[PDB]
Amino acid sequence: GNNYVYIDPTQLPYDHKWEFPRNRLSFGKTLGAGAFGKVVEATAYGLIAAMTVAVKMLKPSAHLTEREALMSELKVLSYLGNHMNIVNLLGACTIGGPTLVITEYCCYGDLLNFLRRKRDSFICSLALDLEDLLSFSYQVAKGMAFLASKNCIHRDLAARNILLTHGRITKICDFGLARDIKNDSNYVVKGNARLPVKWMAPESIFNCVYTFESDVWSYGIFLWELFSLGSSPYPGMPVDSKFYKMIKEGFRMLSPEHAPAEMYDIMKTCWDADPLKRPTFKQIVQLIEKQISESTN
Ligand SMILES: Cc1ccc(C(=O)Nc2ccc(CN3CCN(C)CC3)c(C(F)(F)F)c2)cc1C#Cc1cnc2cccnn12
Numbered sequence: 591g592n593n594y595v596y597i598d599p600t601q602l603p604y605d606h607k608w609e610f611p612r613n614r615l616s617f618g619k620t621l622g623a624g625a626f627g628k629v630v631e632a633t634a635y636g637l638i639a640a641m642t643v644a645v646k647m648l649k650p651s652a653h654l655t656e657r658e659a660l661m662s663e664l665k666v667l668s669y670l671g672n673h674m675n676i677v678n679l680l681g682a683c684t685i686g687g688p689t690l691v692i693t694e695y696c697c698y699g700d701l702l703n704f705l706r707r708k709r710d711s712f713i714c715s716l717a718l719d720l721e722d723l724l725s726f727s728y729q730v731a732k733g734m735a736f737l738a739s740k741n742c743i744h745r746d747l748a749a750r751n752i753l754l755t756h757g758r759i760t761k762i763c764d765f766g767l768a769r770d771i772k773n774d775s776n777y778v779v780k781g782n783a784r785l786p787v788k789w790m791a792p793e794s795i796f797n798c799v800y801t802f803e804s805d806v807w808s809y810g811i812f813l814w815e816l817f818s819l820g821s822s823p824y825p826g827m828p829v830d831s832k833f834y835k836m837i838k839e840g841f842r843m844l845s846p847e848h849a850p851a852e853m854y855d856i857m858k859t860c861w862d863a864d865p866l867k868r869p870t871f872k873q874i875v876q877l878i879e880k881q882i883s884e885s886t887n
Contacts, residue, residue: 592741593802599662602669610637610681610692615645621699626652627660627767631695634681643680646768647690656767657689663766664691670740675733677753677763696753696761701726704754705820712819712848720848723816724885726752726760727853728878733762734809735871738802745800747808748789749815750776776822778829788823792837793865803865809874810860817849838863852881 618631621644632645646663648656667679681692698704711717730752737744744751746764753761771777777784780795791807793799811823824843827833842861845854856877862868869877 595741596743597666597669597741599666599669600658602662602665604661604665604684605668608664608668608679608682609685610634610683612683612687612690615643615683615690615692617645622765622768622770623649624765624767624770625649625772626656629765629768632692634692637680637692642695644693644695645690646693646766647688648767650688652688659767660689660691666742667691667693670737670742673733673736675729675760675762676736677761693763694755694761696755698754698758700750700763701752701754701760702749702815702820705749705816709819714848718819720850721882721885722758723848724850724853724878724882725758726754726816727813728875728882729760730762730812731809731871731874731878733760734805735875737762738805738871743800743802744805744808746786746789747805748776748786748812749820752812787829787833791865792863795834795837801865802870803868806860806868806871806874807865809871810857813849813853813857813860814843814846817846817853819846819848821846850881850885852877 614635616633618633621629621631627646627648629644629646632643634641634643637643646660648660661684664682670676672678677696678694679691680694683690708718713719734744734747744764751762751764753763755761771784776786776788778787780787787795789808789811791804794804814823815821824833840863842858856869856874859867859869
């Protein structure tokens with residue numbers, strides 16, 4: 591069934607129940623920006639009282655193409671619904687001004703910078719420790735399991751696309767238009783596209799197919815970011831003809847030092863060249879559940 595269909599976001603309904611009075615939004619600092627869009631912190635009144643929210647709005651430079659993208663984004667978040675381990679949609683202002691999408695604000699920011707900020711404090715096996723890492727590994731697989739169950743393929747899963755909020759709960763997100771991928775070197779020109787190659791499955795790279803199983807490969811690379819406390823993958827190794835050659839041959843990363851053995855076995859299986867031998871996210875959630883209990887006490 592689900593291997594043969596996909597949701598076309600332009601074919602989803604937009605319910606106007608999301609529409610929010612744009613004069614009840616007060617904008618604050620920018621959290622991230624791309625050419626045509628940005629994500630800004632904001633205050634919203636009477637949305638659920640004053641509350642802090644995040645807003646992804648189009649810049650003045652933006653074209654119909656980017657507006658369409660943002661409207662499709664709105665439709666997908668509405669379609670996905672609101673869940674613990676995915677960024678939650680709160681509202682939108684799509685007329686009478688810049689088109690924008692309103693979500694919850696995640697108070698600890700994106701996971702990659704957080705891990706980097708916390709690397710030096712790390713308590714080997716408040717500060718970070720192994721159960722934090724396991725908890726994040728679990729919550730991301732769990733969120734992805736839900737995405738897969740809705741037949742939603744992420745395509746840019748990596749630590750930079752995860753946010754962290756209260757109680758060290760992770761929220762999968764996608765900055766999309768509001769990231770400056772031209773000046774982010776994790777995105778590499780490949781044809782007529784800058785792509786997150788070091789995170790991508792071979793079949794995606796060479797064949798431009800993105801599947802449930804290619805997201806699992808990126809999750810593997812994410813695991814390596816996580817247990818490497820925010821290190822860039824394939825250190826010292828530029829994307830080029832040689833890098834492509836080497837992934838195709840079976841070259842893979844060695845375990846991060848802080849990864850339990852079972853976590854690295856998960857990474858390795860995520861990285862199988864045969865998409866069909868990779869675990870599903872449902873399976874990963876199970877294995878990590880067990881690890882977390884074993885690692886407790
Ligand atoms: C305002 C805002 C609007 C939208 C989104 C957003 O994540 N959009 C999104 C679009 C698509 C998809 C799924 N597709 C992926 C592509 N794929 C090809 C198809 C399926 C998903 C996903 F979560 F489901 F993954 C999310 C995030 C923010 C934020 C924020 C925020 C909150 N706190 C902080 C603190 C610091 C910085 N930012 N920030």
